[PDB]
Design a binder for this molecule. Structure first.
Ligand code: MG
Ligand code: MG
Ligand code: MG
Ligand code: MG
Ligand code: MG
Ligand code: MG
Ligand code: MG
Ligand code: MG
Ligand code: MG
Ligand code: MG
Ligand code: MG
Ligand code: MG
Ligand code: MG
Ligand code: MG
Ligand code: MG
Length: 47
RNA sequence: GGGAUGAGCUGUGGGUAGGGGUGAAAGGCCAAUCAAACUCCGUGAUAGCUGGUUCUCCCCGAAAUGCAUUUAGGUGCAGC
């Protein structure tokens, strides 16, 4: 009863990763690090 | 300082338009930009390049080597 009693099952919802938001998380390169192709583009799988 | 009756100077009106014009020829000039004007559109062109990418704490923690490469400052697989 009482919609303020419904909650999701544990582990079903996790927070997304926000990737360009300071040093305490994926810092400034947002997990890329590099300076080459992969810093700005994707490499085709066939390559 | 040169020309200053001449292949002179100048007013008004007109014509030639972009791979086109015009040039007593310098790649010169075509509205302060010309080895191909300007504006809008394709268009948020592309850039293996340069720059930037924003709150927190806990655990772990590298690599700068091999092979291949229109390859060597890029990338694929291996290694970590
Ligand atoms: Mg910073
Ligand atoms: Mg990453
Ligand atoms: Mg890289
Ligand atoms: Mg580097
Ligand atoms: Mg950087
Ligand atoms: Mg594709
Ligand atoms: Mg004389
Ligand atoms: Mg004289
Ligand atoms: Mg006219
Ligand atoms: Mg042109
Ligand atoms: Mg010359
Ligand atoms: Mg001019
Ligand atoms: Mg051209
Ligand atoms: Mg298009
Ligand atoms: Mg440690």
């Amino acid at each position: 009863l009482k919609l303020h009693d419904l909650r999701p099952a544990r582990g079903s919802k996790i927070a997304r990763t926000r990737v360009g938001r300071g040093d305490g998380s994926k810092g400034k390169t947002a997990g890329r690090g590099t300076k080459g192709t992969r810093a700005r583009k994707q490499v085709p799988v066939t390559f």
